[PDB]
């Protein structure tokens, strides 16, 4: 099972981007998303989609991201442009058996992300979006099969 | 060569999402992005990245999207949740030889998108983001090789 940890969410600014992270997480095979800043509006919007499109994905907001990431029972992945090439590490991760927590920020990433993560992982070495980084991470994790998943 | 056509851009609201579409386009192997609403700020931000990270990607804003899409010399792809499965059609598209224009909207898509497109293409049947839809479309088009591209 993969859980997404979305940090640097600003509820009075980032409704759309974080919504897109959550939709992406769900569609590409993650079981849950945890969001650092409490946002009831976001929760409502995503629960609306879960209701209408099905499946058992969950969203929590207002999380202590450092403690979640530090104490997660499984592999801690941090998506970052400065990390190791996804294609270099994805097979180890997948073949490990373990649950995975994948951290995506909004560009202003704290140092604790690098300090905690088991793997710091780049999806290309170019500046992209947390949304596209996550989509590619999950696609590679699931070897493209997440297209066969039914909700 | 692939060009991205981003429509439904609202300059006084959608700076971040559209920026992410543009970054994603560039990193995943598109040659250009055309944006419907004029946005000099966006152009400046993306030209900043092109300068600093290299390569020859281009951005134009203020485009007549219907006329661009209608008269594009090549295959017109519209990314939409209601389309044909990407995996069903991507090989035809790739093997055609032709340049490709890929249209991504912001959810409120006009009918002209369906009317013009050579292929209406779904990346999963679930609601996702234009950013993640595009990333997957380009990855599949390039068969994952866009990770070997140098800027
Ligand atoms: C607002 S974009 C910044 C965030 O997107 C993600 N990100 C951006 N570019 C990349 C990249 N090249 N590889 C992996 N993750 C990235 C990271 O999680 C970062 O915290
Ligand atoms: C604000 S999200 C709406 C836009 O994202 C893209 N999009 C969203 N969901 C999908 C999907 N499942 N497959 C393909 N494109 C999609 C389409 O281009 C749409 O115009």
Coordinates of C-alpha atoms and ligand atoms in Angstrom, one line a residue:
Chain A
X1 CA 0.0 0.0 0.0
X2 CA 1.2 3.5 -0.9
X3 CA 0.3 6.6 1.1
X4 CA 1.0 10.1 -0.2
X5 CA 2.2 12.8 2.1
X6 CA 1.6 16.3 0.7
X7 CA 3.3 19.1 2.5
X8 CA 3.5 22.8 2.0
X9 CA -0.3 23.0 1.4
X10 CA -1.6 26.5 1.9
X11 CA -5.5 26.2 2.2
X12 CA -6.2 29.8 1.3
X13 CA -4.1 29.6 -1.8
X14 CA -3.3 26.0 -3.0
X15 CA -6.8 24.5 -3.2
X16 CA -6.4 23.6 -6.9
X17 CA -2.8 22.2 -6.9
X18 CA -3.3 20.1 -3.8
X19 CA -6.7 18.9 -5.2
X20 CA -4.8 17.7 -8.3
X21 CA -2.2 15.9 -6.1
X22 CA -5.0 14.1 -4.3
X23 CA -6.9 13.2 -7.5
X24 CA -3.6 12.0 -9.1
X25 CA -2.8 9.9 -6.0
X26 CA -6.2 8.2 -6.0
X27 CA -6.3 7.5 -9.8
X28 CA -2.7 6.2 -10.0
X29 CA -3.1 3.6 -7.2
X30 CA -2.3 5.2 -3.8
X31 CA -4.5 4.1 -0.9
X32 CA -4.4 7.4 1.0
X33 CA -3.2 11.0 1.1
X34 CA -2.2 12.9 4.1
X35 CA -2.0 16.7 3.9
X36 CA -0.1 18.9 6.4
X37 CA -2.5 21.8 6.7
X38 CA -6.0 21.3 7.8
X39 CA -8.4 21.9 5.0
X40 CA -12.1 20.8 5.4
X41 CA -13.0 22.2 1.9
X42 CA -10.4 20.0 0.3
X43 CA -11.5 16.9 2.3
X44 CA -15.1 17.6 1.1
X45 CA -14.1 17.9 -2.5
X46 CA -12.1 14.8 -2.5
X47 CA -14.7 12.8 -0.6
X48 CA -17.2 13.9 -3.2
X49 CA -15.0 12.3 -5.9
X50 CA -14.5 9.1 -3.9
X51 CA -18.3 8.8 -3.4
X52 CA -19.1 9.4 -7.1
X53 CA -16.2 7.5 -8.7
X54 CA -15.9 4.7 -6.1
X55 CA -13.1 2.8 -4.3
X56 CA -11.8 3.2 -0.8
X57 CA -9.2 6.0 -1.0
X58 CA -8.9 8.2 2.0
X59 CA -7.9 11.7 2.7
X60 CA -6.7 13.2 6.0
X61 CA -5.7 16.8 6.5
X62 CA -4.0 18.6 9.5
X63 CA -1.2 16.0 9.9
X64 CA 2.1 16.4 11.6
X65 CA 4.1 15.6 8.5
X66 CA 7.5 15.3 10.2
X67 CA 6.1 12.7 12.7
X68 CA 4.1 10.9 10.0
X69 CA 7.1 10.6 7.7
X70 CA 9.6 9.7 10.5
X71 CA 7.4 7.0 12.0
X72 CA 5.8 5.5 8.9
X73 CA 6.1 1.7 8.9
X74 CA 7.7 1.1 5.5
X75 CA 9.9 2.9 2.9
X76 CA 10.0 6.7 3.1
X77 CA 10.3 8.2 -0.4
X78 CA 10.9 11.9 -1.0
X79 CA 10.3 13.2 -4.6
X80 CA 12.9 15.9 -5.4
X81 CA 14.7 17.1 -8.5
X82 CA 18.0 16.6 -6.7
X83 CA 17.4 12.9 -5.8
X84 CA 18.4 9.6 -7.3
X85 CA 17.0 8.7 -10.8
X86 CA 13.7 7.0 -10.3
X87 CA 14.6 4.3 -12.8
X88 CA 17.7 3.5 -10.7
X89 CA 15.7 2.7 -7.5
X90 CA 12.1 1.9 -8.4
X91 CA 12.7 -1.9 -8.7
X92 CA 14.3 -2.2 -5.2
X93 CA 11.4 -0.2 -3.8
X94 CA 8.8 -2.3 -5.5
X95 CA 10.4 -5.7 -4.9
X96 CA 10.9 -4.8 -1.2
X97 CA 7.3 -5.9 -0.3
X98 CA 7.0 -2.9 2.1
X99 CA 4.4 -0.2 2.3
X100 CA 5.6 3.1 0.8
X101 CA 5.0 6.7 1.9
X102 CA 5.8 9.2 -0.9
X103 CA 6.4 12.9 0.2
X104 CA 5.7 15.7 -2.3
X105 CA 6.2 19.3 -1.4
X106 CA 5.5 22.7 -3.0
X107 CA 9.1 23.6 -4.0
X108 CA 9.9 25.2 -0.6
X109 CA 10.9 21.8 0.9
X110 CA 12.3 21.6 4.5
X111 CA 15.5 19.8 5.2
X112 CA 13.7 17.2 7.3
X113 CA 12.5 15.7 4.0
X114 CA 16.1 14.9 3.0
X115 CA 17.0 13.9 6.6
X116 CA 14.2 11.3 7.0
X117 CA 13.7 9.8 3.6
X118 CA 15.0 6.3 2.8
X119 CA 15.1 7.4 -0.8
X120 CA 15.3 10.8 -2.3
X121 CA 14.0 10.3 -5.9
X122 CA 14.2 12.4 -9.0
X123 CA 11.6 12.2 -11.9
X124 CA 13.9 13.8 -14.5
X125 CA 16.5 16.4 -13.3
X126 CA 14.3 19.3 -14.6
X127 CA 11.9 21.4 -12.5
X128 CA 8.4 19.9 -12.8
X129 CA 5.3 19.7 -10.7
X130 CA 4.5 17.6 -7.6
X131 CA 1.5 16.4 -9.7
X132 CA 3.5 15.0 -12.6
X133 CA 6.3 13.7 -10.4
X134 CA 3.8 11.7 -8.4
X135 CA 1.9 10.4 -11.5
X136 CA 5.2 9.1 -12.9
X137 CA 6.3 7.7 -9.5
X138 CA 3.1 5.7 -9.1
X139 CA 3.1 4.6 -12.8
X140 CA 6.6 3.2 -12.4
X141 CA 5.8 1.6 -9.1
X142 CA 2.8 -0.2 -10.5
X143 CA 4.5 -0.9 -13.9
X144 CA 1.7 0.8 -15.7
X145 CA -0.9 -1.6 -14.4
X146 CA -2.7 1.0 -12.4
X147 CA -4.7 1.4 -15.7
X148 CA -6.3 -1.9 -14.9
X149 CA -7.4 -1.0 -11.4
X150 CA -11.2 -0.7 -10.8
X151 CA -12.7 1.6 -8.2
Chain B
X1 CA 7.7 17.2 -32.6
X2 CA 4.9 17.6 -30.0
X3 CA 3.3 20.9 -29.1
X4 CA 1.0 21.4 -26.1
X5 CA -2.1 23.5 -26.4
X6 CA -3.2 24.7 -23.0
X7 CA -6.7 26.2 -22.9
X8 CA -8.9 27.6 -20.2
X9 CA -5.9 29.5 -18.7
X10 CA -7.1 32.3 -16.3
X11 CA -4.0 34.6 -15.8
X12 CA -5.3 36.2 -12.6
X13 CA -6.0 32.8 -11.1
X14 CA -4.3 29.9 -12.7
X15 CA -0.6 31.0 -12.7
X16 CA 0.6 28.0 -10.8
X17 CA -1.4 25.2 -12.5
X18 CA -0.5 26.5 -16.0
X19 CA 3.1 27.0 -15.0
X20 CA 3.1 23.3 -13.9
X21 CA 1.6 22.3 -17.3
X22 CA 4.4 24.2 -19.0
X23 CA 7.2 22.8 -16.9
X24 CA 5.8 19.3 -17.4
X25 CA 5.5 19.8 -21.2
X26 CA 9.2 20.9 -21.4
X27 CA 10.6 18.2 -19.1
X28 CA 8.7 15.3 -20.7
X29 CA 9.8 16.1 -24.3
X30 CA 7.3 18.6 -25.9
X31 CA 9.0 21.3 -28.1
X32 CA 6.5 24.1 -27.3
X33 CA 3.4 25.1 -25.4
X34 CA 0.8 27.5 -26.6
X35 CA -1.5 29.1 -24.1
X36 CA -4.9 30.6 -24.9
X37 CA -4.9 33.7 -22.6
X38 CA -2.1 36.2 -22.9
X39 CA 0.1 36.0 -19.8
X40 CA 3.4 37.9 -19.9
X41 CA 4.2 36.9 -16.3
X42 CA 3.9 33.2 -17.2
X43 CA 6.1 33.7 -20.3
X44 CA 8.8 35.4 -18.1
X45 CA 8.7 32.6 -15.5
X46 CA 9.0 29.8 -18.1
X47 CA 11.6 31.7 -20.2
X48 CA 13.6 32.0 -16.9
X49 CA 13.6 28.1 -16.6
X50 CA 14.5 27.6 -20.2
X51 CA 17.5 30.0 -19.7
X52 CA 18.7 28.3 -16.5
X53 CA 18.0 24.7 -17.3
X54 CA 18.7 24.8 -21.1
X55 CA 17.3 23.5 -24.4
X56 CA 15.1 25.1 -27.0
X57 CA 11.5 24.8 -25.6
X58 CA 9.2 27.7 -26.5
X59 CA 6.2 29.3 -24.9
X60 CA 3.6 31.5 -26.7
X61 CA 0.5 32.9 -24.9
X62 CA -2.5 34.8 -26.3
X63 CA -3.3 32.1 -29.0
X64 CA -6.5 31.5 -30.8
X65 CA -6.8 27.9 -29.6
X66 CA -9.6 26.8 -31.9
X67 CA -7.7 28.0 -35.0
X68 CA -4.4 26.6 -33.8
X69 CA -6.0 23.2 -33.1
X70 CA -8.1 23.1 -36.3
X71 CA -5.1 24.1 -38.6
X72 CA -2.3 22.3 -36.9
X73 CA -0.3 20.2 -39.4
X74 CA -0.3 16.8 -37.8
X75 CA -2.4 14.7 -35.3
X76 CA -4.7 16.6 -33.0
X77 CA -5.0 14.9 -29.6
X78 CA -7.5 16.0 -26.9
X79 CA -6.8 14.7 -23.4
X80 CA -10.1 13.9 -21.7
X81 CA -11.4 11.4 -19.1
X82 CA -14.2 10.4 -21.6
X83 CA -11.8 9.5 -24.5
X84 CA -10.3 6.3 -25.8
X85 CA -7.8 4.5 -23.6
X86 CA -4.3 5.9 -24.1
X87 CA -2.8 2.4 -24.3
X88 CA -5.3 1.6 -27.1
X89 CA -4.1 4.5 -29.4
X90 CA -0.6 5.6 -28.4
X91 CA 1.2 3.2 -30.8
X92 CA -0.8 4.4 -33.9
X93 CA 0.0 8.0 -32.9
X94 CA 3.7 7.3 -32.3
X95 CA 4.2 5.2 -35.4
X96 CA 2.4 7.7 -37.7
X97 CA 5.5 9.8 -38.1
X98 CA 3.4 13.0 -37.7
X99 CA 3.8 16.0 -35.4
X100 CA 1.3 16.0 -32.6
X101 CA -0.6 18.8 -30.9
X102 CA -2.0 17.8 -27.5
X103 CA -4.8 19.8 -26.0
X104 CA -5.3 20.0 -22.2
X105 CA -8.0 22.1 -20.6
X106 CA -9.1 23.1 -17.2
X107 CA -12.1 20.9 -16.8
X108 CA -14.5 23.3 -18.4
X109 CA -13.7 22.0 -21.9
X110 CA -15.5 23.5 -24.9
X111 CA -17.2 21.2 -27.5
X112 CA -14.8 22.3 -30.2
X113 CA -12.2 20.1 -28.5
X114 CA -14.2 17.0 -29.2
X115 CA -15.2 18.2 -32.7
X116 CA -11.7 19.0 -33.9
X117 CA -9.5 16.3 -32.3
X118 CA -8.3 13.4 -34.4
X119 CA -8.1 11.4 -31.1
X120 CA -9.9 12.0 -27.8
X121 CA -7.6 10.2 -25.3
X122 CA -8.2 9.1 -21.6
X123 CA -5.4 8.7 -19.2
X124 CA -7.4 6.5 -16.8
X125 CA -11.2 6.9 -16.6
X126 CA -10.9 8.8 -13.3
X127 CA -10.8 12.6 -12.7
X128 CA -7.2 13.7 -12.7
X129 CA -5.2 16.8 -13.5
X130 CA -4.2 18.2 -16.9
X131 CA -0.6 18.1 -15.4
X132 CA -0.6 14.3 -14.7
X133 CA -2.6 13.5 -17.9
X134 CA 0.0 15.3 -19.9
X135 CA 3.0 13.7 -18.1
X136 CA 1.6 10.2 -18.8
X137 CA 0.7 11.1 -22.4
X138 CA 4.3 12.2 -23.1
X139 CA 5.9 9.4 -21.2
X140 CA 3.9 6.8 -23.3
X141 CA 4.6 8.7 -26.5
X142 CA 8.3 8.6 -25.9
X143 CA 8.2 5.1 -24.3
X144 CA 9.9 6.4 -21.2
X145 CA 13.0 7.6 -23.1
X146 CA 12.3 11.3 -22.3
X147 CA 14.4 10.5 -19.2
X148 CA 17.5 10.3 -21.5
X149 CA 16.8 13.6 -23.1
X150 CA 19.5 16.3 -22.4
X151 CA 18.6 20.1 -22.4
Ligands
LIG1 C1 6.0 23.3 -6.9 S1 7.0 22.0 -7.6 C2 8.1 21.3 -6.2 C3 7.8 19.9 -5.7 O1 7.5 19.0 -6.8 C4 8.3 17.8 -6.8 N1 9.2 17.8 -7.9 C5 9.5 18.9 -8.7 N2 10.4 18.6 -9.6 C6 10.7 17.3 -9.4 C7 11.6 16.4 -10.1 N3 12.4 16.7 -11.1 N4 11.7 15.1 -9.6 C8 11.0 14.8 -8.5 N5 10.1 15.5 -7.8 C9 10.0 16.8 -8.3 C10 8.9 17.8 -5.4 O2 8.1 17.0 -4.4 C11 8.9 19.2 -4.9 O3 8.8 19.3 -3.5
LIG2 C1 -8.8 20.6 -14.1 S1 -8.6 18.9 -14.7 C2 -9.4 18.9 -16.4 C3 -8.5 18.7 -17.6 O1 -7.5 17.6 -17.3 C4 -7.4 16.7 -18.3 N1 -7.9 15.4 -17.7 C5 -8.5 15.2 -16.5 N2 -8.8 14.0 -16.3 C6 -8.3 13.3 -17.4 C7 -8.3 11.9 -17.7 N3 -8.8 10.9 -16.9 N4 -7.7 11.5 -18.9 C8 -7.3 12.5 -19.7 N5 -7.2 13.8 -19.5 C9 -7.8 14.1 -18.3 C10 -8.2 17.2 -19.5 O2 -7.4 17.8 -20.5 C11 -9.2 18.2 -18.9 O3 -9.5 19.2 -19.8

